[PDB]
Design a protein around this ligand. Sequence first.
Ligand SMILES: [Ca+2]
Ligand SMILES: [Ca+2]
Ligand SMILES: [Cl-]
Ligand SMILES: [Li+]
Ligand SMILES: [Li+]
Ligand code: NA
Ligand code: NA
Length: 581
Amino acid sequence: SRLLGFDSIPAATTDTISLPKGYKSSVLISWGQPLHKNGPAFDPSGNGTAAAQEVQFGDNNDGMSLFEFPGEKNRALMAINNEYTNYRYLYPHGGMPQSAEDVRKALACEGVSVIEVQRKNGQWQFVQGSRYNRRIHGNSPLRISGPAAGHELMKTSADKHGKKVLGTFQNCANGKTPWGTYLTCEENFTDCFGSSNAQQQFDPAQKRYGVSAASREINWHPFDPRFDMAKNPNELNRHGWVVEIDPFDPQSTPVKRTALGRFKHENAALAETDDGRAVVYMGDDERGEFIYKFVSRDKINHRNAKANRDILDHGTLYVARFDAGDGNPDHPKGQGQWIELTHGKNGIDASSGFADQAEVLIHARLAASVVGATRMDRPEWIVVSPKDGQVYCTLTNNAKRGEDGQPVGGPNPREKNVYGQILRWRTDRDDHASKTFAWDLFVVAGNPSVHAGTPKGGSSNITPQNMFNSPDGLGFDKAGRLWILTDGDSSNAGDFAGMGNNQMLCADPATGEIRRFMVGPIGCEVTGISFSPDQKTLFVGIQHPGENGGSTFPEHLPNGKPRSSVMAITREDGGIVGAHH
Ligand SMILES: [Ca+2]
Ligand SMILES: [Ca+2]
Ligand SMILES: [Cl-]
Ligand SMILES: [Li+]
Ligand SMILES: [Li+]
Ligand code: NA
Ligand code: NA
């Protein structure tokens, strides 16, 4: 490979970061770090307050982007998602929230952390006390824009006009726009809602989005009625959006961009049509849900960033259908298409339950079913090659593939899929405006040690040396290396014998070759990726280390508390990460 400059490292099970020879890692920032001058220190006992957590780096850091600081080669901003929190570590009692203050403290953990980093003696470090440092959390005041802003379904007792919402939370992954803004994606937002009525009736749209009376072991609703569907059912509609943040304006109000649709958003992959309009590819991470694409009405104004204020409020949302492909077991290839989600088109109208375009967007999942989108094996991150524009999407796994309604075929080639696969497409004419594409499975993950010579052994670019499961995050670097991050089963047993802890790998898009680059600590997943502009630092997240009680990473104090961290990975010889020595 021209691209892969390091030797594939062994799988590992240690409570450490493992890297190739000549590489090193440092903690950039961890959950609980105060952001502001004289801010409250992290308290490992759990006794930190909600108010303190609102001014500290959030928990479970996830997707992130780095923004070059105009005029300053040795400064940058990073916007980093904080997806959820770990009650065993958050509270001294280690259990469910017990009060309104406990619920406020959990909401404080989630959202986005904007931080400044500065380079000193070659190394990037967090700058506490920067005027740019900011928490946006689950109680922050946000705006709603786009076609669904002000709709009846978006109004609540607290917000009678449907344009002002408290919080972004369950922030999974990210996008970075060419007009200098950050997109954060609300994914498992429904988990946070419940009802004081255990026998709560839910309507078909509520059921399709997966709300329950119990909540998903979040249990905010007993103390914060905003999350109690018996009282505030339309609050469910005011989350599940892509939210746009200006990291360079620390007093700006972030905006929920309803034109991009409501669903369990993983990330938001930016591209541009040949005629200059913005394109955002988006996955909905749930078994049997869909892949989407938004194309703006307006051209991006590259020279005048602020002129793009409303660009994500106008345009067209599409959803994918994939054909059956050619059935090749190692490397299936086919065609697919984008289908418009527009009131009055493709059978989307009052007769199929949509009064207007706002409802199409609020209930995008339902609209996409009407038009016959292809049910997918848990779409997670999407990236677009900077070299050739080809688009890659992880399909992390789907244990229910093969069940009635989720047939095996095309880009979902295995029943009871525990390993996942990476889907690629090439938009027609290499124009992201096109409504058709060619697709192929770039890799089918598997375990060829345990399941040699069967579909569970994976595709031929998987070997016993490099094998992994449940690819999730993705990132390209400027050279065109594809970085693959995992959130899989870390048992190192059974179907996963030999795979070890979660990990990051690097792939050559042209050749299909994959090499293991990093292994993370016990109980984590590896998520979030950004590069310095010079490509000599790779920033990567280690999320929920010790989720089941087996880690003290990164500090390794005796009987210590593990902390989600952003790591900085560099070469000892100062060269470009991933490249030859
Ligand atoms: Ca993920
Ligand atoms: Ca995942
Ligand atoms: Cl198709
Ligand atoms: Li994530
Ligand atoms: Li996970
Ligand atoms: Na740089
Ligand atoms: Na653990």
